[PDB]
């Protein structure tokens, strides 16, 4: 395939979840928390790991 | 209704000092149909004999010694009578349909055939190539090859496994003799039945038959009827693949009880529950037959049919669907699920209809003269006498839910089935899978 971003087994996973993903247009700001919750997690796991090391 | 049944005339029966059983149903109809039904099929053939009975069928009409082709044909056509017939694995027959003003003439014609076929060494050689061709036509009918293959594997290694028409080799080489050898061995009064239905009165029939069927038995063999070697069923599969065909055919089945057995009624009632579909129906709302409904909702198949084909001491209780290369699986999944449902959690609301639908068939099973005759012919030959609608009624008028289950499960649950499938069948899962599709995770 052409795009080579929609054919690759892994990118296709990303380009279908953070790009090309159909989202309503009128999404409110309340929908910003799933995002935050996720990055909130990345953050904990990081700081935590780094903290567990001591 | 019950009265309508109760007022249905009895079917007269009587054997000759010969051995032939002469039965009939007098009606009124200016027309009628009479014929003989033989206790002979392909089942009775050998590895080298197989096909005879069929080669034989294709000559039965082409003339007798008493009256050559040109004549026999001319004499029947001329009286507006119709002569037709067939042969299965355990049952052959020849029947004529005229104006009951000719019982005697018909009766004579009949006899003259089942007793003196010309077997013109010159005619034979012709039909030989006619079959070999006709056979290559029966072939592309993937709806029939499939059943043959079913029997093949279902009763592999036994007399039943052989197809009614037979191998091309046999047909290419059967001898003027073999045919005669097949005739004089199986066409005997004890195994034959002369049946009729129409304006015909029994006596005139008997006499007429008793007159043209002048057979005489000396020894005890002649007078006795030989029982066949049992046929071993085998849970197995056979896959004739070819993605070259438009769609696939599938047929799965368990061993059947056999004419004699009663349950063939309850079992006959169950099949009425799953019934059959066919893209020309009008019904995403079909009463039960979810298999049909589902088949419609999810487009599972082109059609399918439930069947309880049975024989003397065995049979086949299964189903067959025609489907697109891609919906083979779901179809099989969904169907095979219905058998389980059928014998594991059936309901009265279901069996109730089941029955009715049967009774309506049971009756239309006798719509006309030719068909009635077929029952008398058969019934006697396979059951022993005749079963009046009045009877079939009760038999299948007292089947409740618990009865269906008990039986179906008795014949279906955790049994090793026999499947067959020609066409683009890559999607049909392995045996093991369809196998474990024989037990419900109750």
């Amino acid at each position: 395939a052409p795009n080579i971003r929609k054919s690759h087994p892994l990118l296709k996973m990303i380009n279908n979840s953070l790009i090309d993903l159909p989202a309503p247009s009128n999404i409110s700001a309340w929908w910003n928390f799933g995002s935050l919750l996720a990055v909130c997690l990345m953050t904990q796991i990081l700081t935590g790991l780094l903290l567990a090391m001591h | 209704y019950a009265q309508a049944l109760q007022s249905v005339p009895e079917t007269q029966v009587s054997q000759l000092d010969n051995g032939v059983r002469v039965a009939s149903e007098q009606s009124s109809q200016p027309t009628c149909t009479v014929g003989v039904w033989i206790d002979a099929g392909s089942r009775y053939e050998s590895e080298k004999n197989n096909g005879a009975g069929y080669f034989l069928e294709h000559l039965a009409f082409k003339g007798t010694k008493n009256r050559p082709q040109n004549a026999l044909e001319k004499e029947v056509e001329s009286m507006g009578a119709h002569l037709n017939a067939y042969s299965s694995r355990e049952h052959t027959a020849y029947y004529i349909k005229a104006l009951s003003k000719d019982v005697p003439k018909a009766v004579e014609l009949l006899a003259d055939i089942v007793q003196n076929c010309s077997l013109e060494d010159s005619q034979i050689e012709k039909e030989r190539d006619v079959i070999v061709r006709e056979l290559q036509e029966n072939d592309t009918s993937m709806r029939e090859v499939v059943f043959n293959y079913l029997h093949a594997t279902a009763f592999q290694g036994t007399g039943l496994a052989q197809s009614v028409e037979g191998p091309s080799e046999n047909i290419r080489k059967l001898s003027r003799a073999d045919l005669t050898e097949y005739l004089s061995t199986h066409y005997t009064a004890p195994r034959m039945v002369l049946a009729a239905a129409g304006g015909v009165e029994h006596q005139q029939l008997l006499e007429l038959a008793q007159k043209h069927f002048g057979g005489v038995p000396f020894t005890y063999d002649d007078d006795a009827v030989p029982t066949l070697s049992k046929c071993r069923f085998t849970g197995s599969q056979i896959r004739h693949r070819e993605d070259g065909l438009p769609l696939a055919h599938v047929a799965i089945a368990v061993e059947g009880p056999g004419w004699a057995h009663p349950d063939l009624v309850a079992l006959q009632v169950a099949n009425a529950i799953i019934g059959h579909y066919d893209r020309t129906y009008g019904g995403g709302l079909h009463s039960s037959s979810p298999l049909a409904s589902i088949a419609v909702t999810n487009k599972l198949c082109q059609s399918f049919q439930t069947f309880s084909i049975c024989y003397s001491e065995t049979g086949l209780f299964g189903f067959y669907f025609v489907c697109d290369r891609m919906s083979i699986d779901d179809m099989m999944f969904v169907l095979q699920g219905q058998w389980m449902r059928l014998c594991t959690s059936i309901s009265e609301s279901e069996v109730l209809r089941g029955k009715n639908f049967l009774r309506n068939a049971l009756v239309s099973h006798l719509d006309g003269t030719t068909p009635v005759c077929e029952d008398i012919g058969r019934e006697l030959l396979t059951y022993g006498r005749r079963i009046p609608l009045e009877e079939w009624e009760e038999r299948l008028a007292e089947v409740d839910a618990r009865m269906v289950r008990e039986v179906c499960s008795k014949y279906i649950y955790d049994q090793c089935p026999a499947v067959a499938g020609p066409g683009p069948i890559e999607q049909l899962p392995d045996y093991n899978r369809i196998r474990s599709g024989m037990f419900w995770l109750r």
Binding site: - | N138, D139, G157, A161, S229, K230, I238
Partner: protein
């Protein structure tokens, strides 16, 4: 033509001794399934332990 086709012989070849024509396969197999399932029944059993 398909009429020209037979199923090879598994007789002896593979079939267990209770399987050779002219004898109902059915009288002998509730015994055949009984064995197999018993073996499996036992494994589930041993495994639980």
């Amino acid at each position: 033509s398909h009429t020209d086709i037979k199923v090879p012989n598994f007789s002896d070849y593979r079939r267990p001794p209770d399987d050779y024509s002219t004898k109902s396969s059915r009288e002998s197999d509730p015994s055949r399934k009984g064995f197999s399932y018993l073996v499996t029944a036992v494994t589930t059993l041993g495994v639980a332990y």
